Amino acid sequence: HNKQLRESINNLRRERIMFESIQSNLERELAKLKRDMADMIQQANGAFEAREKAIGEMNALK
Amino acid sequence: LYYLLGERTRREHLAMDMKVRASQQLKKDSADDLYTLTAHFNEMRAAKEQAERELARMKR
Amino acid sequence: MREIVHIQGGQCGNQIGAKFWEVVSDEHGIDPTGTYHGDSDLQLERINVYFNEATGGRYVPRAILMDLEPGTMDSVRSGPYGQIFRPDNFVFGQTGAGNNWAKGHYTEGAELIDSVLDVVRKEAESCDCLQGFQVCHSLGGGTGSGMGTLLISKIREEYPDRMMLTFSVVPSPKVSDTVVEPYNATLSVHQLVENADECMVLDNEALYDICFRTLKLTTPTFGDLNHLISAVMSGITCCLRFPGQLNADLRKLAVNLIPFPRLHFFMVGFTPLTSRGSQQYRALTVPELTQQMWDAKNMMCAADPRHGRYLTASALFRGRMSTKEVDEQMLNVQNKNSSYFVEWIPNNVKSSVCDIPPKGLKMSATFIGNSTAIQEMFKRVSEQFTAMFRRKAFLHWYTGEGMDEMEFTEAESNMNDLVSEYQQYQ
Amino acid sequence: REVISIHIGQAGIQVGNACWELYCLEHGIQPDGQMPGDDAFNTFFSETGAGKHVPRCIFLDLEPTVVDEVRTGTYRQLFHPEQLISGKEDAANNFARGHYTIGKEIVDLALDRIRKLADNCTGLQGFLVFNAVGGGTGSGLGSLLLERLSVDYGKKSKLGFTVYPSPQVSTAVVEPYNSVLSTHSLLEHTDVAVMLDNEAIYDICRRSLDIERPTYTNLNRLIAQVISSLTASLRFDGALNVDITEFQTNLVPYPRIHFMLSSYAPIISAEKAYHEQLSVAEITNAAFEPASMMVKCDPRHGKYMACCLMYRGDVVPKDVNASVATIKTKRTIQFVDWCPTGFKCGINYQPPTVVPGGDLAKVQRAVCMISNSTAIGEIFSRLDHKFDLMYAKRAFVHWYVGEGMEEGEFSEAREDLAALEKDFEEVGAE
Amino acid sequence: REVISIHIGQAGIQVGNACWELYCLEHGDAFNTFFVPRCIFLDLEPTVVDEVRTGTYRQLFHPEQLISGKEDAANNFARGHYTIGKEIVDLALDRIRKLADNCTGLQGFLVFNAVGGGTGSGLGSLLLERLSVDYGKKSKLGFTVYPSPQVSTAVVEPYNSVLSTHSLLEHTDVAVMLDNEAIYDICRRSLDIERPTYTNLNRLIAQVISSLTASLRFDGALNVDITEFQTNLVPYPRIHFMLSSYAPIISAEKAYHEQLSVAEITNAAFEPASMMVKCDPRHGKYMACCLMYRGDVVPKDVNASVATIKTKRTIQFVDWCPTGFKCGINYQPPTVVPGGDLAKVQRAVCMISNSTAIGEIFSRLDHKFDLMYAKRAFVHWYVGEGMEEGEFSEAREDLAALEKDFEEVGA
Amino acid sequence: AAARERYARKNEQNELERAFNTIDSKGDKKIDAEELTELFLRLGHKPKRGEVEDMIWEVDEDCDGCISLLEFQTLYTRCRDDKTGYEPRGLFNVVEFVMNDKNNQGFITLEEAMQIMYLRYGRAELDMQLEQVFGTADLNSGKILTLTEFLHCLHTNQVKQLLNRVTAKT
Amino acid sequence: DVKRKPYDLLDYSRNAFDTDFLEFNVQINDLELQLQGFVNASF
Ligand SMILES: Nc1nc2c(ncn2[C@@H]2O[C@H](COP(=O)(O)OP(=O)(O)OP(=O)(O)O)[C@@H](O)[C@H]2O)c(=O)[nH]1
């Protein structure tokens, strides 16, 4: 009976390995996605900043 | 003792599973955010293509 | 499914069980040769609780006969339904105890109970999920008291998480067969308080008055008393063998009826019990069953509950009946006679219904009441024990065999604290 | 629009043997499972293979006999064998044995059967559980199963139709302990929980159904009618429909007040049916008198928070709305001040059918009322008296403590129910 | 399009007694791939072979095809490899040659053996060696029976299993593991036979074999021949040991109530409670899966089901293989055998995958083998038969290399 | 009671790091079952046939096989705050002994410092784990500490409430 | 409180002050950390 209990415990610990492994992959993927989030925000912001400049010069020239 | 070690290990494994499930929610919705936000970038991109187009018209 | 092995000790235990297996086999439709002849499927589906199919429709009872004299064992195989028991289950000494509890507990026990335990162990592992054990014995004899007592102690050490019943007749001053009855009673009960899960107190006085006034018999031989006791024992286990509207196993009754762990001695009754002159003039209703059930004279113990208060009570009903009548009858019998029931427990009566009556009757009942009046019996034997012990009469067969003086003093002390804690909880 | 129904314990699956008989008879399905559009049956039965219908239900119990009669009964074919769960030994009116000793190994199998039932469904409305809190199987693994359901789904509705132990009519002794320890989880795990006393159903069938000797069969029969009446809105189209997520919002004014008094109308016998016509006006009256309620308690001592009204049959919204107006302007019953409108009505077209051998007459139209009030607070106090009455000397606690419990949960659960008493009382106060 | 099947040992030809019963019943031009049958039973004990000769199929089998020796191998790999195999193996392969000569488009050979015995291990390995020399390029499908950890009928079966697998690496191209304890558990759990014999086991093994060769016998929406398993499931030349599973293994009572569709049976084929090998695929990481579909199945839902599997997280996949599936659809529904314990089904699925849970089995076997070998127990029997002390240790180190290979690839 | 524990951890951390390195005999970070026997020999105690395997089995719970310094702090902290956890403590004891050692034969009065840190307890409670008396000192070794701790944990674990429960009198 | 206790401090005939010293040694560090927080708290 002790041996039976031992095997059940070993199983839960082994099941933990793959879960924690896939969790590490998910953090990496979410990190890659969120870094891209910051980079794309900056690019969109640059276009907007450029836009107000172009509109101001057009109005001023007139 | 072993009958209770098993309960603590089961608790630890479930605490990881509910964590894994929550991680998938973060993965999914963040992908959705990229689609909506890149649409926003295209709209601003479209705005400036039309914008510098009419500037040159006024210059000529 | 759930299985109960049967253990019969001594002469009283052996003869009680012989009539028990006859009555049970008639309920399931097995002829004395041990073959199946029933009609309904409800009889074949629940014979694994008490029997094992051997080969070709051979159903053998799951019972163990155990004693110290050959006369009892031979008297079993002589009578009908005597050929159904497996001969290996006749664990059996030869010398005898001689109504000497020490000889049944220290001298002769040491060489038989090991053999008894082998057969009992084989019958426990022969089944899958034990519900409990069932022991029928006396408290005044030697080979029933001492032999069965040590067996009970050893069994509880082996299988502790399992139920256990002991159907025990106790001695009383008016029906006094042996002379050393108090020495046997107080020591035997001293073991039952710490070993048995729950015990059912029986005595011969009540049996004699049931056959005098209710049954109105002229020559009540021991066959009729054993016939009465068998109907009660079949009633306590009908829930395991037949489906019903409200099932109640052994564990369900014990956990519900025993409010404190040492207070597990019960008083029993049975209904209906009617004479042949009045078996035609009666009706069969739940209230008619209830009053004859709760009657003081109809208790199968000579301890009047109306001298005290009821702690808990239980009813096991058998037959096609309406559960509303069951519940409203228990409520009414508790409301009119409100003083006879304990106060700090509301609804002191648990009830259950099974849909299969005993063969030959339309509707029956079985009462199991845990009252506080039982302390009378403990005092009634305790003073007789102290009266004898304060001059050391009949002591040399006790002290010369292995008991010391402190064992009897331990017995009195445990006797006295139990009657004192009954007095507190009442 | 699929909902699965789970039955826990002896009383639980007995109620189910009435409901499923009634259900198959409504949709013309033979007891062997085959029919000799029409998707109304889908909410309870999945069409397997060709011309075969399987219910969306599991029976489970710790004792073998009560489940076994169903296996060999008339409906051997209707239910897939795996659904009918059984144990090896009973909990024996012991909450601890059902929550720590035997539940712990039966409920894992239960949930991985529940898993694929939910997976087979598509637009799962919710669950509905059937148990009596007096026993051990219904209480112990009942509360346990609810806890595990809350961590599995959480957001999905869990309709719990529970039977409380009646004050006077009772079969067990230790059922006070069972009810308190079970309620302690019935609070924060069930979304919507309906009480069903036993004395009420007994007293109804003695007066209205004029059956002087009623057994459990008739009790289970009328419970099926109530359940059928609030699922008719999923099964058949109506003039004004209400779904299972409407009780969530309209009947629970606070996250710890979900205990509803059920009542049905008209409970009328076969012969009186001829003599009295049953229009909408008189039946809307009959849905409020305490002589036709499913819990023996007096709502006159309390004030209503919100009520729901199922109507079945040929009912137009005109006269039912007029009748609801008439009820609110009367003063033999009263409403809580801050809630001006206390009702939610609903009408569905199909009339309730009759089962052969049943005692309900064939009626033009019927009403099922599900209200919420403060008379529920009287039951909890009445229960506290006789629970504490026995606990003050530690009676029967030795079984539960030996089975795995301690002194902490008696004291802490008792005081938690006491806090619940204060919650009902404070809301009542203006 | 023809494939011939050889059956070795008491276990191999009893399995064959179920396989050919199913084949002839199934075919009552499509039969050309199997039909006289294209088989050779061969064994060293004549008792089981003469059961075939006096059975009901006395006329079906050509008399010479039934090969039978004169004395047993005594459960000794050495005896069945060097002493008695040397006389029977030459007659066996001299028959396989002209059976292959009668064929024209031979896909490959498929062998049935149990590695715990003497014949199945010894001359089974010997026969595979000489076939690799003679043909080489033709596929050899090896359906072996490895010994279970806790259920065992012999004592020295660790010796035979290690000594057989050492050659099973470089001889068979496709190798399918089937334990007995796992199938016992399957027949107890799903088929609810509380008392199963070898007959029930051999019956559902034949169902698996027939399901993976049905693509040749009958045209399907997406056919998959014997060369596809060779390519799509073996990422490296030394990893070829495949878990097998089949669904639905359902009794008559349960099947009619259940609604069998592709998504749920694709799920059922991936739980460890329905595999033919007692191993925990959760303990491992999948490399590649192959899904055989028979019956009424359209390509949509098989693709939908495979998508749900890849997104679930109780089972994880290897990083070197993102597209780890090879599906196959065939029109013909699975046939039944009168007396068989399986009910008729509209559609069935046979999964043949590859993981690292098998890497756990070989370590578990190595420990038991290692314990007995150190104190030279039972070694003297094999040495007397013609072997020596060297080859036990060298076979041990070969399994050690395999353990390292699984731990490294899974990384 | 927190201050005793926090202050104790503040000082024992540096002792613990060297205790780890010293237990290792291969100059690596991994503690093999092989090393444990060598340590016991240094203490002067002998393991049983399967003791070491249990010792390695119970501690490690994030991977299988040899142990790592990360597992070792996890064990340390969990066991230290374990008190009402009914948790394993097979390899905690040997390390706590080595850290609480500075004499290289064992320690005498320092048990009390160990005891007070775990709980104020009582002089009678001290007479439970061992037989040390306030005035007298003793000689001690590895043999007499591990065995007594292990036995005490088995003694507490056994006692539970079945019919040993006691209710206030009527 | 330490210097009001019945035992003589110079005598090793009692040897029970060895629990008083390890109670003193914890509130000395408590005083240390209280003064450290006071320094950290006035800036
Ligand atoms: N309404 C109704 N209640 C029932 C029925 N059968 C039993 N009960 C109730 O069930 C309560 C006791 O619990 P049971 O269901 O009988 O048994 P249990 O809940 O399974 O607990 P165990 O006996 O340990 O298995 C009683 O108070 C009865 O009122 C029934 O058919 N209908």
Ligand SMILES: Nc1nc2c(ncn2[C@@H]2O[C@H](COP(=O)(O)OP(=O)(O)OP(=O)(O)O)[C@@H](O)[C@H]2O)c(=O)[nH]1
């Ligand atoms: N599946 C299945 N396995 C079998 C059968 N018969 C034997 N086995 C397995 O075969 C192994 C034992 O080796 P055997 O096959 O009996 O040995 P053999 O092939 O007869 O070789 P020899 O006995 O030495 O002549 C064990 O794993 C048995 O479980 C069978 O009919 N079906």
Ligand SMILES: Nc1nc2c(ncn2[C@@H]2O[C@H](COP(=O)(O)OP(=O)(O)O)[C@@H](O)[C@H]2O)c(=O)[nH]1
């Ligand atoms: N009911 C019943 N009681 C009996 C019978 N025979 C003896 N007794 C009782 O047994 C007691 C004496 O016990 P005894 O038979 O000597 O027990 P044993 O020697 O241990 O088997 C007396 O008080 C009798 O009342 C019988 O046939 N039926």
